mmCIF file of C-alpha atoms in Angstrom:
data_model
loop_
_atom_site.group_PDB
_atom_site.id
_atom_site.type_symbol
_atom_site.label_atom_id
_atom_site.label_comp_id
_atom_site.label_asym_id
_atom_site.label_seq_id
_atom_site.Cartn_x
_atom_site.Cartn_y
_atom_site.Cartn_z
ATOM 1 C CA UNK A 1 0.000 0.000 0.000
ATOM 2 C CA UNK A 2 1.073 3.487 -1.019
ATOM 3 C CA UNK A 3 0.857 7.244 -1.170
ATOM 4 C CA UNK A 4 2.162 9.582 -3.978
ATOM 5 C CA UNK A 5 2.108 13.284 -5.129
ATOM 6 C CA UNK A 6 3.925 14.698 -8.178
ATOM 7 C CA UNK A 7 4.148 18.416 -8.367
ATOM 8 C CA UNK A 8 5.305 20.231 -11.817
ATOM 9 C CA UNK A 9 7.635 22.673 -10.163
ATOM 10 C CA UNK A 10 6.309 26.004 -12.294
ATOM 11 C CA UNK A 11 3.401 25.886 -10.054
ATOM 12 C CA UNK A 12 6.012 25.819 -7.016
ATOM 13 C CA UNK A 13 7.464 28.631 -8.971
ATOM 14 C CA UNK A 14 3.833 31.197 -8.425
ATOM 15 C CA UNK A 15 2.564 29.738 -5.081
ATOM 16 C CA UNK A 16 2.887 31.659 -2.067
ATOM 17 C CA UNK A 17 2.656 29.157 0.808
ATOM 18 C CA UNK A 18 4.335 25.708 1.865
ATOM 19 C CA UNK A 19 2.217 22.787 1.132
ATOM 20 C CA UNK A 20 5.274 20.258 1.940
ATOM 21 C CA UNK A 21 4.208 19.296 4.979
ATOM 22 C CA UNK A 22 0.575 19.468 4.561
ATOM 23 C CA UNK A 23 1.404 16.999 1.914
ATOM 24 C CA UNK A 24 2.908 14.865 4.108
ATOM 25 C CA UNK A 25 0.619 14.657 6.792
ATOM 26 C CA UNK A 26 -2.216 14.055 4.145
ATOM 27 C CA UNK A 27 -0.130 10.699 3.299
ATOM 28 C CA UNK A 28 0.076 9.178 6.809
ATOM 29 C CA UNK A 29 -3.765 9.867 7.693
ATOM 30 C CA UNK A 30 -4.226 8.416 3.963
ATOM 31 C CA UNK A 31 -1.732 5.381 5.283
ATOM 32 C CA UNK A 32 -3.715 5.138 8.942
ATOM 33 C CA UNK A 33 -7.391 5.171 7.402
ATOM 34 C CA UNK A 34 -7.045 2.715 4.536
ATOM 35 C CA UNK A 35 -5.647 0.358 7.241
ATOM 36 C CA UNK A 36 -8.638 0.852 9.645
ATOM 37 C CA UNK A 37 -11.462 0.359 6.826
ATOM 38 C CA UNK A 38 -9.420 -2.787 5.551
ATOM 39 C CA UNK A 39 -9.319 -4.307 8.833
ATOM 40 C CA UNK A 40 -12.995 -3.035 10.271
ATOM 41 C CA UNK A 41 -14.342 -4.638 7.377
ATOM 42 C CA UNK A 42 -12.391 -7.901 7.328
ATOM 43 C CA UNK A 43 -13.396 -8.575 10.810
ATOM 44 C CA UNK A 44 -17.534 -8.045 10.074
ATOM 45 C CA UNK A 45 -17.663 -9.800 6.726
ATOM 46 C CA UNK A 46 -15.140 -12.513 6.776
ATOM 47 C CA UNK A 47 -16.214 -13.464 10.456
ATOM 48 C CA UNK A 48 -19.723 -14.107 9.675
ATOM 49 C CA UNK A 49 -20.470 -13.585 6.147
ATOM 50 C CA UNK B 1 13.081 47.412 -18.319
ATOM 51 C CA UNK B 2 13.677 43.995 -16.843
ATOM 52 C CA UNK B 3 12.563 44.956 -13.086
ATOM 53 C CA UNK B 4 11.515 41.335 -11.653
ATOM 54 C CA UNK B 5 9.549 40.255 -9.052
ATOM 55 C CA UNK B 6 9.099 37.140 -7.022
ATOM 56 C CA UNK B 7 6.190 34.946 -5.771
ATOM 57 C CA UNK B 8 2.890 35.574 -7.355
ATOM 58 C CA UNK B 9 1.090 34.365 -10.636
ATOM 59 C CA UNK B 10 0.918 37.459 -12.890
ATOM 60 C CA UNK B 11 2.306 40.842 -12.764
ATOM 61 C CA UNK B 12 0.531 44.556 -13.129
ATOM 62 C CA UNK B 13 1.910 48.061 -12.781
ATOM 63 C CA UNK B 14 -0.583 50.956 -12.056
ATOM 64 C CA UNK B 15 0.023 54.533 -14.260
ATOM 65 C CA UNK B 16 -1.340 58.221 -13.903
ATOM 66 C CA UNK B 17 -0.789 61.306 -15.421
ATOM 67 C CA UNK B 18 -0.451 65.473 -15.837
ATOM 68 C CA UNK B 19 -2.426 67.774 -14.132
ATOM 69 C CA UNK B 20 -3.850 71.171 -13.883
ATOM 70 C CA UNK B 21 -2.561 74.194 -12.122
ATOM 71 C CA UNK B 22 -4.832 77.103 -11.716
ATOM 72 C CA UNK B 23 -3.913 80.005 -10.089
ATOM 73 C CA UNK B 24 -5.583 80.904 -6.868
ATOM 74 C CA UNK B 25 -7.345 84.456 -6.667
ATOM 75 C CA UNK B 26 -6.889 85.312 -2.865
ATOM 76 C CA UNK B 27 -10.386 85.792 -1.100
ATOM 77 C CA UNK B 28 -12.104 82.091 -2.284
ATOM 78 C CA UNK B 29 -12.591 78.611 -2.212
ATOM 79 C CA UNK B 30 -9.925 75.729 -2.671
ATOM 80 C CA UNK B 31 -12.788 73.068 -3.345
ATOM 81 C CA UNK B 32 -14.141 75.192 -6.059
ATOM 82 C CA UNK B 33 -12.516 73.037 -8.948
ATOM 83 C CA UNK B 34 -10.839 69.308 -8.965
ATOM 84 C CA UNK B 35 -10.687 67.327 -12.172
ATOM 85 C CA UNK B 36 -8.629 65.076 -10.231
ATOM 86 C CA UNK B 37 -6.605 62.431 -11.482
ATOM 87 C CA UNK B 38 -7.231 59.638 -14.170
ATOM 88 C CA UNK B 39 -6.272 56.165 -12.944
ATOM 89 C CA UNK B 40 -5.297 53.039 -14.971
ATOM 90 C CA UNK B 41 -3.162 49.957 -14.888
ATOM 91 C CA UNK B 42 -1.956 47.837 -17.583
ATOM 92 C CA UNK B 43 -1.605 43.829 -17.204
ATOM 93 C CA UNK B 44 0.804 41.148 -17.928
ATOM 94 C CA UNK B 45 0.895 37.807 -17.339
ATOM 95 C CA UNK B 46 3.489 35.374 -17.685
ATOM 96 C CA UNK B 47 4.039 32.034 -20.318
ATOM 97 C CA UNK B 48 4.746 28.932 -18.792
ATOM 98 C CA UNK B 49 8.875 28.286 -18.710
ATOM 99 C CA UNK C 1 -24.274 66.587 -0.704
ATOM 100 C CA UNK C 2 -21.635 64.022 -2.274
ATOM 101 C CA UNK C 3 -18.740 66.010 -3.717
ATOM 102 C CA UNK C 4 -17.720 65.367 -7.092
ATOM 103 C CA UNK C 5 -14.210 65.079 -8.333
ATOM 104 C CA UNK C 6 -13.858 62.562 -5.159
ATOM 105 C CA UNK C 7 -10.351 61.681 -6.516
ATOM 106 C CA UNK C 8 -11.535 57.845 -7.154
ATOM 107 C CA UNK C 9 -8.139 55.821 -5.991
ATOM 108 C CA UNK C 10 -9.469 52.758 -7.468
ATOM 109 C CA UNK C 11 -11.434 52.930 -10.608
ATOM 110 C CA UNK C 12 -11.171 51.426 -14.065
ATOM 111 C CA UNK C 13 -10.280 54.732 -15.705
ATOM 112 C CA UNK C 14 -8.569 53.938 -18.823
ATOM 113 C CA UNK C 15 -9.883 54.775 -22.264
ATOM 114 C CA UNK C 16 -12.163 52.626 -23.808
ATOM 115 C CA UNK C 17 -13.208 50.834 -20.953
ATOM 116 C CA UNK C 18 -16.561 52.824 -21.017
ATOM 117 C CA UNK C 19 -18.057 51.568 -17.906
ATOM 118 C CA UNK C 20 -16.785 52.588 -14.483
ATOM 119 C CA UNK C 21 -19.305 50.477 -12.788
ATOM 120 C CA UNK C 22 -18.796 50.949 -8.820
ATOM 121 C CA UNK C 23 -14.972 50.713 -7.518
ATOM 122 C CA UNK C 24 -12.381 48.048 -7.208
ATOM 123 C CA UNK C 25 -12.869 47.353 -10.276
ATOM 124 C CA UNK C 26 -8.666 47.742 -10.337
ATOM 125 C CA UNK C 27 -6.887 46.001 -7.038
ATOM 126 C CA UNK C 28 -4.908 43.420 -5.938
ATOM 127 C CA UNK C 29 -7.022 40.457 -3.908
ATOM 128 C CA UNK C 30 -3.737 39.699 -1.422
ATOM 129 C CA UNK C 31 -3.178 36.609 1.109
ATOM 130 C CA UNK C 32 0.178 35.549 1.634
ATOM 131 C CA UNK C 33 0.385 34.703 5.362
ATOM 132 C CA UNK C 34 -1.514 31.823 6.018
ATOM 133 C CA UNK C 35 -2.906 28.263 4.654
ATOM 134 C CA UNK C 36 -5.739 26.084 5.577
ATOM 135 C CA UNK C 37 -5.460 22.425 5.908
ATOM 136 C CA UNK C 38 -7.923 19.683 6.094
ATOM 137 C CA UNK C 39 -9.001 17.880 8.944
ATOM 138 C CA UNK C 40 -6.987 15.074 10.930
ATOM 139 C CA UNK C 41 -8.501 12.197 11.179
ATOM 140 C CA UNK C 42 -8.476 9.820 14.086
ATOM 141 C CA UNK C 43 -7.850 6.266 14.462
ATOM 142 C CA UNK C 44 -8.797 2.887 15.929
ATOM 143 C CA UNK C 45 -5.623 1.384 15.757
ATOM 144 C CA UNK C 46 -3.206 0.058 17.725
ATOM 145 C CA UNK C 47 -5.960 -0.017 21.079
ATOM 146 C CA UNK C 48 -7.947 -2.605 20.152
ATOM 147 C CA UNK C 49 -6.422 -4.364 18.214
ATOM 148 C CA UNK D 1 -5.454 47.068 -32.215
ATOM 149 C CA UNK D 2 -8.798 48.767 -32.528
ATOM 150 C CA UNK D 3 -10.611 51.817 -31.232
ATOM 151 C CA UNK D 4 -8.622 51.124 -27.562
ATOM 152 C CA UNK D 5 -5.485 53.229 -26.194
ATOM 153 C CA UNK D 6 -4.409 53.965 -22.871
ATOM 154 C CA UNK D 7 -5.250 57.130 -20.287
ATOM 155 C CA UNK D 8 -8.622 58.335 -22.292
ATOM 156 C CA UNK D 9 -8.000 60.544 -24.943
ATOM 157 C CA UNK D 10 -4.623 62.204 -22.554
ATOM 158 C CA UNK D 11 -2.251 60.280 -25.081
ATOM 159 C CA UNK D 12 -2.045 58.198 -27.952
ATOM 160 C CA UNK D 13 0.007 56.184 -30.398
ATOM 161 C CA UNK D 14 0.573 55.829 -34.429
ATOM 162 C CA UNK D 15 2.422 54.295 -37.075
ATOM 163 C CA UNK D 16 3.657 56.307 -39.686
ATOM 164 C CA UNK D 17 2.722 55.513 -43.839
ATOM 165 C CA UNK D 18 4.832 55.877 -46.166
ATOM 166 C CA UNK D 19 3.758 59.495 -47.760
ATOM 167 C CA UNK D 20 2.401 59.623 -51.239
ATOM 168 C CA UNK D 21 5.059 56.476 -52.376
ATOM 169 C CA UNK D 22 4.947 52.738 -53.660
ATOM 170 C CA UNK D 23 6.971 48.977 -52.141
ATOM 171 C CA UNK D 24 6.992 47.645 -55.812
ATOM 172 C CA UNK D 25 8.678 50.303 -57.707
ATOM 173 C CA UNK D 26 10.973 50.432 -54.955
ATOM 174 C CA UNK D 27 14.394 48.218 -53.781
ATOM 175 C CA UNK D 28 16.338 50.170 -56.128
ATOM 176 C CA UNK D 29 18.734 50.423 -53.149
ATOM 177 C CA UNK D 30 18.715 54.311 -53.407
ATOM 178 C CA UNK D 31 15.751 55.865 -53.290
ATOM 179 C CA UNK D 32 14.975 53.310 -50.746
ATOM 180 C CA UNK D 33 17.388 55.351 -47.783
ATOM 181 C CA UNK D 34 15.938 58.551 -48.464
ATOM 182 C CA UNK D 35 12.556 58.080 -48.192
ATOM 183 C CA UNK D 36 13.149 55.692 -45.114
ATOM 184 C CA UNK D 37 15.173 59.160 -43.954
ATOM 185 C CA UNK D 38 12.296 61.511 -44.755
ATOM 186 C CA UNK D 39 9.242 59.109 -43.508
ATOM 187 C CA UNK D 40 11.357 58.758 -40.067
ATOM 188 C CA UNK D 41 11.702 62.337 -39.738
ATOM 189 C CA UNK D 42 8.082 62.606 -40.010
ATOM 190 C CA UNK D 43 7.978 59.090 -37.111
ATOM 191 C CA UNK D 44 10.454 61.592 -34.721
ATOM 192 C CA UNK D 45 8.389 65.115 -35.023
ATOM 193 C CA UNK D 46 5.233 62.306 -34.453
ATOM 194 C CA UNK D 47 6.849 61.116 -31.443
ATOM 195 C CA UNK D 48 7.942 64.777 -30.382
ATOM 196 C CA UNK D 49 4.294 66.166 -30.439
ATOM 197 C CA UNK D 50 3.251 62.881 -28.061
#
């Protein structure tokens, strides 16, 4: 499992703030949430489905 | 020219221009007469790389 | 009373423009000091698991 | 452009013709300079009166 972002660098060019870490952060909660769906709904189907 | 500038998408620079000096017959009002000032900008915005 | 010639800082102006609807019209919309980020999202995990 | 200059009627632009003269005739290498000389005259005074 996996998380990317490509950014063409003109845009970094005419931006005015950071977004780098932002970025980041966005990835791990991605990471975290995708694991907690996967695993909620393994237990309640493959239990007793 | 040449004058750069840093951060933001496009660029602008505002203009103006002449004016009218009247004399001033001692004895009455200051507020009598302003044409003012005309006020205009002209736009430019940048090409990709 | 209004008073005319009100010196108009912002206004179209120009030439050809005709117009001259309201002000600002001409004006820089400016925000370089801040940035709002989504929300963090909790997590289940580890805990219960 | 058409019908639009800058600061309402306060200034304005042109681009000079060549006066009362003809492109085909011409490249005779000569006659060529002086009206170019003449016409550019005429472009500076232009300018001046701006």
């Amino acid at each position: 499992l996996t998380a990317d972002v490509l950014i063409y660098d003109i845009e970094d060019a005419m931006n005015h703030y950071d977004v780098r870490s932002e970025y980041t952060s966005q990835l791990g909660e991605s990471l975290a949430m995708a694991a907690d769906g996967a695993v909620l709904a393994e237990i309640a189907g493959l239990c007793n489905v | 020219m040449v004058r750069s500038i840093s951060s933001g998408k496009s660029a602008q620079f505002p203009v103006l221009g002449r004016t009218q000096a009247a004399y001033l017959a001692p004895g009455e009002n200051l507020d009598d007469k302003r044409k003012d000032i005309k006020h205009t900008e002209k736009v430019i915005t940048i090409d990709g790389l | 009373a209004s008073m005319t010639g009100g010196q108009q800082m912002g206004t179209n102006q120009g030439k050809g423009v005709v117009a001259a609807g309201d002000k600002l019209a001409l004006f820089l919309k400016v925000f370089g000091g801040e940035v709002l980020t989504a929300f963090a999202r909790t997590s289940v995990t580890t805990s219960r698991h | 452009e058409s019908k639009y200059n800058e600061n309402i009627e306060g200034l304005g632009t042109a681009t000079v013709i060549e006066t009362t003269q003809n492109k085909a005739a011409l490249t005779d290498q000569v006659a060529l300079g002086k009206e170019i000389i003449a016409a550019l005259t005429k472009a500076r005074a232009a300018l001046t009166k701006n």
